[PDB]
Succinate semialdehyde dehydrogenase [NAD(P)+] Sad
Amino acid sequence: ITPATHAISINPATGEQLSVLPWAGADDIENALQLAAAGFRDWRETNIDYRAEKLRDIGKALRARSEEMAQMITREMGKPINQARAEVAKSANLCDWYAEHGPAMLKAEPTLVENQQAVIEYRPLGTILAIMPWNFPLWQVMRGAVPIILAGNGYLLKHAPNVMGCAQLIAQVFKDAGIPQGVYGWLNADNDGVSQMIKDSRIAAVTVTGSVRAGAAIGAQAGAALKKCVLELGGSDPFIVLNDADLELAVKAAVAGRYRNTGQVCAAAKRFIIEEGIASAFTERFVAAAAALKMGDPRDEENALGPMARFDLRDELHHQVEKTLAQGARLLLGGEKMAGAGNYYPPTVLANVTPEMTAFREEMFGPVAAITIAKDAEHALELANDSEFGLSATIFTTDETQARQMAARLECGGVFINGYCASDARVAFGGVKKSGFGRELSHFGLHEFCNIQTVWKDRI
Amino acid sequence: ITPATHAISINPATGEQLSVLPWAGADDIENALQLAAAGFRDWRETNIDYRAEKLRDIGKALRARSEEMAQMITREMGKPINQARAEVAKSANLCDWYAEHGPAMLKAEPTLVENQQAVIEYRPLGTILAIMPWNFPLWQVMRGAVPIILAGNGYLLKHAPNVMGCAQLIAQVFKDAGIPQGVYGWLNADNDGVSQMIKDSRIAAVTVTGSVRAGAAIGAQAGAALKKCVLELGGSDPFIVLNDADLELAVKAAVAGRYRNTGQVCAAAKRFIIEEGIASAFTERFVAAAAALKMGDPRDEENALGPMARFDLRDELHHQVEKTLAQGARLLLGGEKMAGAGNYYPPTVLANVTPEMTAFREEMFGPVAAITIAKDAEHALELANDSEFGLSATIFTTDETQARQMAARLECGGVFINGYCASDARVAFGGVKKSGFGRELSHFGLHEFCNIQTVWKDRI
Ligand SMILES: NC(=O)c1ccc[n+]([C@@H]2O[C@H](COP(=O)([O-])OP(=O)(O)OC[C@H]3O[C@@H](n4cnc5c(N)ncnc54)[C@H](O)[C@@H]3O)[C@@H](O)[C@H]2O)c1
Ligand SMILES: NC(=O)c1ccc[n+]([C@@H]2O[C@H](COP(=O)([O-])OP(=O)(O)OC[C@H]3O[C@@H](n4cnc5c(N)ncnc54)[C@H](O)[C@@H]3O)[C@@H](O)[C@H]2O)c1
């Protein structure tokens, strides 16, 4: 057993090894690609209304294993159990939502060509290779798999190596739903196996949810293979609070946005940018509220935070904290690794964070808030856009006109005005800059992996 | 002067050197990137109706230099002068079309979120680097530049090195129209210069129209730099004729589709796939019609074909003809380089072309038709899909239902039934497989380089 030969699951609350799974071999890869190719060949011929009904079947099979799934999520990566349950319910509802609204988004599109000669058809592309992360082991898979399969594609999952118990359980749910094994499939492939599949003609495109470094490594290969990719990568979302904000609501949303899933959220509020007049009141309220978050065993529902998922990533997070403190930030809360067998890092708040500091320029993928003072709203917008990332953003202010104007100038894919940032089937998700490109959910996730095909009759 | 240090224009009809231009230097690249960034910063703030009026100004300035532009196209790459005039007219009309229909396509999109709390906004992305080919030196630039700039982006053109006279004239047209500095720009960059620009933060995304080899080279770099790209690459379009086809119309469309622009068309009919019962009658009519095409001085309007654009590519095309004849195909017309100072290659027809031959597997980017016999309609579909390419396709048959079913199974981005394949502002354009990914024209070309942004108010 070694990370060079096996995927390994470890409980981050206890440090105990849970399972191992060897990398797929040459024959496993070939068999997966044959099954995927055969599955897509038949699935692409099915009726759209039949596929919608199969989505409802997926939702039912998932709910039927909802607690088994939630406990597996919590066990493998440390998520508080009620958050894992909420992840299951949101994933199941996504099946029903696309079942109801998806088919109409795939209807032929008329054009302005005379005599109704030309229409746009949304054709399936093929089998989509999907590379997914551990922070939402179910939702991240379902977010793409549901629309991708509804559009008549196949989906081939390469999951993160620390949640292969989750991966096998998801496959069992799709099996329970009667989804053919070619249509939803999966492989415990190492990175070289991923490389081989991208080069294989039976993979039509790639979708990646992960870090910036993974997106660049995989995106380069997809381009070299002339395969389209969607990259949903890291974020360092700004959370702007102006002097006229609803301060109580802003702090509630600020705390929820930073510390949900023990801070391990792509679109988490990570860089708090507070106008000078309200900064002292915001900072004091935010520290007190963050300090009231209980942390411990994620099977105990009194805990708002669990351990972080990966011991090496807690080390990396603490290193970023220490560098930021050494650069001149002030420690207001937390900021030390909990001793013991568990991978615990307490709610942490860093103040006097300047744009030159590590916690302002890197993704802080854990329960570490950075607080930066803005001279005014113009400064707050400049601070917000001064980032390699560009996934999402929040603005708190009672001047809705100003909020709308700032939203137009924020370099990110989502802007929440006076509310709680989240993903939702009804709206687009995805960012700009090093957060990547392409859009998921709504009709965007349905169309990203369609062959958009012009059919033009009698052009004479 | 050597192609190692300079871009060189040579008149293919005469062989005379027209112009030379050294590659852009480090200062030139930096200057262009600075002005692109500043131009985009101000351009993104303008009102959509102002930008629509500026598109009309581009169309006016282009029509004012229409004969000068047409003659420059013909002089640098050999296109018959009336096709160059048509290219200018189509490009000017594209400006007016997007001016009229573009703004509504950029309006905010309602969502299913209750109480109208969330909309989808189509924001500008930044400066788009555009890598373009010589076969339509004006239209390829305008096809993307017009919607890209209408959406509030900037456009930085890296044109093919044999048409830098066209590139400079295009820039003069944008100057005549009053397009602000850095909103439209261009550089005579060598391949390393392109690599540098892709890695530069002031390039937001890349669009490529060119060969499969260029798309793989550039696409890999875009992915590694986390830049979205659109790849519009080569084609080897099938042209299927079944026994019940309107034979006279099929032959007319077959000759027009193969030999327009002296065959140098991405979506040209390149692989003719004819059902056995009608193959002899098709082949004899096609040879006779192809033989009736006049070739010569492209400034003379009686000539349907000019010389090929590049002397090295004629050598390459003839090598493809020789290899295919060596593999067992039959030469029915043409098939030898014309003697003299001009780069002329006659209309050529190769028959008994089987799937294993060079003319069936590679893009024949010149006036060479390949004819393959299909046993039946299912064999024809299989033959059509047995290709690395997948740009467009044509089916001729009076059985509309069968044509619609084949269209759904053709692995390509466009299918023309009983008609002449062409690009048009009102429909999507783009392919699958090694022909690339992404879509141009209609609302697709407008949205490819937008930041699709959710704006959600009061999500509490
Ligand atoms: N934008 C989004 O939608 C979104 C959603 C969730 C998480 N994320 C991001 O995910 C990241 C954390 O999750 P992570 O730790 O699993 O990131 P990660 O990149 O290290 O791992 C992501 C996935 O990519 C695979 N992978 C990584 N490198 C690879 C390579 N060279 N070849 C093939 N496969 C490779 C991993 O095995 C894993 O399955 C954070 O940056 C977070 O912001 C983004
Ligand atoms: N799909 C489409 O919309 C479309 C339209 C027109 C032409 N084409 C294709 O264009 C091709 C012919 O034009 P071409 O001969 O100029 O193709 P080409 O690939 O040789 O050159 C295309 C462009 O890419 C640039 N380029 C090539 N390699 C590069 C590299 N490594 N780095 C940076 N830049 C590079 C060239 O300088 C040129 O500007 C044909 O294959 C044709 O089918 C496609």
